[PDB]
């Protein structure tokens, strides 16, 4: 290469704060780095950030006596000199704990060259905005539906538990009455009164009819529960299907907005008029 300037350097960045550094340096490979101006706004200070060990670091560059360097003594007259020096040499001798090279620099040139008439791009961005807003409205409505459906799943879950408890208490009552009624039917059949025997068949028939009714209720409620669970699973699948294209359109819209901003045309005061 050559001694190409700092302004057009790939790793250098302009008015950049922490949140966008974290946005670009998110889940990237080890050694990924960039250089931006310090938030202290001291003239010609600059800070180096790199993702080593799974977390973003913040190297400070000193500008004492018009010279650059990581610490006393300063041995580089330009930032590019030590940037290339530490790109071509590991940091093992400098710091025993830190052992990494400046492998992959973060460069905006890729996004500058993959983007590709002002009215045409303006209406394209407007259509992108409309699609984004309708997709987000669909996302919000169906997320509300998903949460609500989970609420009804919980409600019929409690209903199923209550029905199950009623079934167990009724079967326990039936077992207890069968166990404590077999030792008194002998006298009843010896005396032979048709009225009270008819009454016991009538009462047992009514009780068994009620048991059948509540069993039918439990079965239909559990059928409703499983079909609503299937609908809930389908809604979740739709969520997982429509999340990634939504976030991709979000990134595309942000890229277009940042390109328009760096172009210098103020679209915020004209697009809103419509």
């Amino acid at each position: 290469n050559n001694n190409m300037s700092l302004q057009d350097a790939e790793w250098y960045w302009g008015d950049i704060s922490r949140e966008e550094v974290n946005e670009k340096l998110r889940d990237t490979a080890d050694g990924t780095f960039l250089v931006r101006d310090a938030s202290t706004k001291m003239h010609g200070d600059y800070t180096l950030t790199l993702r080593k060990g799974g977390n973003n670091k913040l190297i400070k560059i000193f500008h004492r006596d018009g010279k650059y360097g990581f610490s006393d003594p300063l041995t580089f007259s330009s930032v590019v000199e030590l940037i290339n020096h530490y790109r071509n040499e590991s940091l093992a001798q400098y710091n025993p704990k830190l052992d990494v090279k400046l492998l992959y620099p973060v460069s905006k040139y890729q996004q500058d060259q993959v983007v590709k008439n002002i009215e045409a791009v303006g209406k394209k961005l407007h259509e992108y905005n409309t699609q984004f807003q309708e997709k987000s409205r669909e996302y919000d409505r169906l997320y509300e539906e998903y949460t609500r459906t989970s609420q009804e799943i919980q409600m019929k879950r409690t209903a199923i538990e209550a029905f199950n408890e009623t079934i167990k208490i009724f079967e326990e009552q039936c077992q207890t009455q069968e166990r404590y009624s077999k030792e008194y039917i002998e006298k009843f059949k010896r005396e032979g009164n048709e009225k009270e025997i008819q009454r016991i068949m009538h009462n047992y028939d009514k009780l068994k009819s009620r048991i059948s009714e509540i069993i039918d209720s439990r079965r239909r409620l559990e059928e409703d529960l499983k079909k609503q669970a299937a609908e809930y699973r389908e809604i979740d699948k739709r969520m997982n299907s429509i999340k990634p294209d939504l976030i991709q359109l979000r990134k595309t819209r942000d890229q277009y907005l940042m390109w328009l901003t760096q172009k210098g045309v103020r679209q915020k005061k004209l697009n809103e008029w419509l």
């Binding site: 922490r18 977390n55 799943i153 009462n203 009514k206 976030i247």
Partner: protein, 981 residues
Amino acid sequence: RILVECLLPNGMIVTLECLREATLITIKHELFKEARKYPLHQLLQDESSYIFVSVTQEAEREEFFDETRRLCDLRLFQPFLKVIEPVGNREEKILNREIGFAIGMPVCEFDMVKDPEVQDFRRNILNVCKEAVDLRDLNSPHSRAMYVYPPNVESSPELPKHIYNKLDKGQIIVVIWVIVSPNNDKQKYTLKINHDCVPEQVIAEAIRKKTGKYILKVCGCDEYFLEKYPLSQYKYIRSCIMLGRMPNLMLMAKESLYSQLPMDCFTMPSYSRRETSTKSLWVINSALRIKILCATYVNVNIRDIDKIYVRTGIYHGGEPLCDNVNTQRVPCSNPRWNEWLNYDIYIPDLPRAARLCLSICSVKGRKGAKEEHCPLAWGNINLFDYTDTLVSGKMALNLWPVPHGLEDLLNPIGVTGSNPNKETPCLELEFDWFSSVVKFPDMSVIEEHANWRENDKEQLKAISTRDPLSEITEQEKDFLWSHRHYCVTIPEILPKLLLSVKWNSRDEVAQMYCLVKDWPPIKPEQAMELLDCNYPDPMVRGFAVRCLEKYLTDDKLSQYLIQLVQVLKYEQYLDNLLVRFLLKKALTNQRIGHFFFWHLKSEMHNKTVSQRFGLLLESYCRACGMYLKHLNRQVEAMEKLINLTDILKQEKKDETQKVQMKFLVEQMRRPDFMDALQGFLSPLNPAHQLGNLRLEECRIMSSAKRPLWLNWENPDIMSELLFQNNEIIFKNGDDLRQDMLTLQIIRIMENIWQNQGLDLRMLPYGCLSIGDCVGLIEVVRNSHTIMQIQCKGGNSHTLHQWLKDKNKGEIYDAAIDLFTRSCAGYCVATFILGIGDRHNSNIMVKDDGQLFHIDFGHFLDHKKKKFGYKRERVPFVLTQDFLIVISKGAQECTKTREFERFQEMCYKAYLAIRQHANLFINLFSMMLGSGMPELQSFDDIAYIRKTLALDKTEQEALEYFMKQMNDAHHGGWTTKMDWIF
């Protein structure tokens, strides 16, 4: 008409027409009355031997010992009554029923769990419960009134100097009402007394001028003077001094207060009564190893995705201890991996608070060169349990759904544990089996594991002054770690020193433990930031809890109660020092305990922390005492109000408001509503008692979702002096956590400005969220929206002429200056915080001239972040209507002192807040995990960092402020009123 199908124990049934108002006494009487006609009646025993049982509407077979309770409020399932023999005592069963009703879910679910941590916490928290209970009875009967009516005083007995001049040479005129003997009549005495007076000599002077023996009381509500504090320290007295009001107090008898105050008793539940050398963890020599067996099932399509994988990594708080380790992308048809996973971390280097954060992510190749990822579900696993043992062996983990608005692959700040539901994606885990139980080493191994001055200290203080989220570099970290032994002289640097160390080591972590164990105690506000998600170490949180125990007072504890409740979720284990301190403080202060209960009660709709908070309500309700009756009454009132709302909000969208009013009044003719809505303390303030419920001024307005306006007559004996009617808006369908946070921040800013020496007073009214999008709003009497003010006025002078004719004479200038000060305070607050734009309706003006804001939404500029653009917005633009009042309608402001006074007071407010910004940074850092869309990570606190211009020094912060509030005002805000240098 209610048909109840009784179930007799002898095998017969009956279809009986049961009246709505009949209780179980009549049911049992008429049941046994007709039993004789039925056969086999001889087998029946006496009524005592049989007790009715049934299954409740909330799906639990709950005992029914409440024989005198009415039929309407039984929350019963399908109508049937079961008769069994008694199987236990009655007092604890009634207590458990009341506790479960207060919490929301029955204690049977809490009892029927298999997790040993839940049972151990339930068994062990009762120790501090009974300790607090016996502590509150140590000075009986004085301590009983101490608990029930604790003093509402301020932290320091010293009076601010700027308000001492407001007094008549440091003395207060005090009016003392007293009942003569036959009651009634209006007999008034007024006494002049200084500020540092104590109530015993106050009553001594009152008695000695009349012609532990009497007690004071604030007229209108229940506030009492008990403890040896200066009379000016009480909040009521200070409020009256600020308002220039005569403090109305009445004299009562201590014996009557002791008689009307009920007794308190604590009963131990039935579950209360229910070697080996081992090798340390630091001797194992092997990397951490995880096996992902399979995922049972995931919710993702076949023709919309191609391949999925699990994205997992070790964390310590939010700081990864190692890089994320992935698996081979398997097809989504068969989520089977069977892949051993290795990490670049050794077992002895694992910190105590280490976690295993994992997620299921889907990769889409697309035609683009770069591939994108989208998480499916997430789940966090503690590598250690509450018994300090490394997790091992077979384990299955249920996975939570991804939060809305979160796009990062993992969720390292989240609840550790499995989703309670079983219809969720379950990931199969497996840990290395070390043929034994691996335990974290005890304090001795750490303690003796270790041990194996220049004037350039200004850098340490300089980095101490910066905010916790300031830019910190590894040069700063190395400087901090190198001079850690000299950091004792500056205890401020403890959070920065903690953030300097990296937690994937052992020797330096031991050294940090040795340092923290000998750290001097620090300010409660400086130790409160040590409780957020960034400090998960048990020793650090123990030190912070110790500092809160030593130095935090009850006033400040009630000030920061909501954040202290919030940081209970960040605690990894159920039993810890923070919850013990919170429960000890809530069991010795009824006012604190009330808000504790209501905060935790609101925060249980979230199933992530449902169990860990349900256990807290369980323990507190066991140990709170007689307050259960008032809490149950409040809960009944709130749930009936919720029913009243949601039977109309969704079912009556398409009808006119007249039919809605008819529906509302016809249920307000149902005696149950009046019966429940009487004589219960307001949840907003327990000192208020709500009496009768009138209907002439209880209605709904034309808002978006018809909030309920409710009025209660004050039943106090001499309520005429104070407010006569209590008005509360019951809002349903709007989240109020952000509103509570906004009002809290307003209260701290007002306190800061008052303490500093500025009369920049606001109106921080009362808000309380009681559950899902439901809450109570305290409304202000004699207040109007600017919208209706200008509507009745009419154009630009309507507010000015309103303030003219509402209070004319020598009081006009007082109204003008109060308006100016309130307007300046709210300008500064709304600029700094970033509340949504103000309208005519959002701004509320009082009769005497004070103004305030009522409608709050998102605070950290969340609503206007749809379009990506870094800029600062000023919501409270000063319209010409306000400038007319500020300048008193002057044509030109260049020869009036009012404009420059307004400027300088705004600048002083901004400088005060910029000096105290650490408190707000810590508060928004502690309130992160609440689940608000507007506050999800530190990028939101970056907004409050850049509106106060933390990075900029105090010089250009001024110029930045004036640039904001003049390009928002289209100019007109220029230069400096006085050049200092």
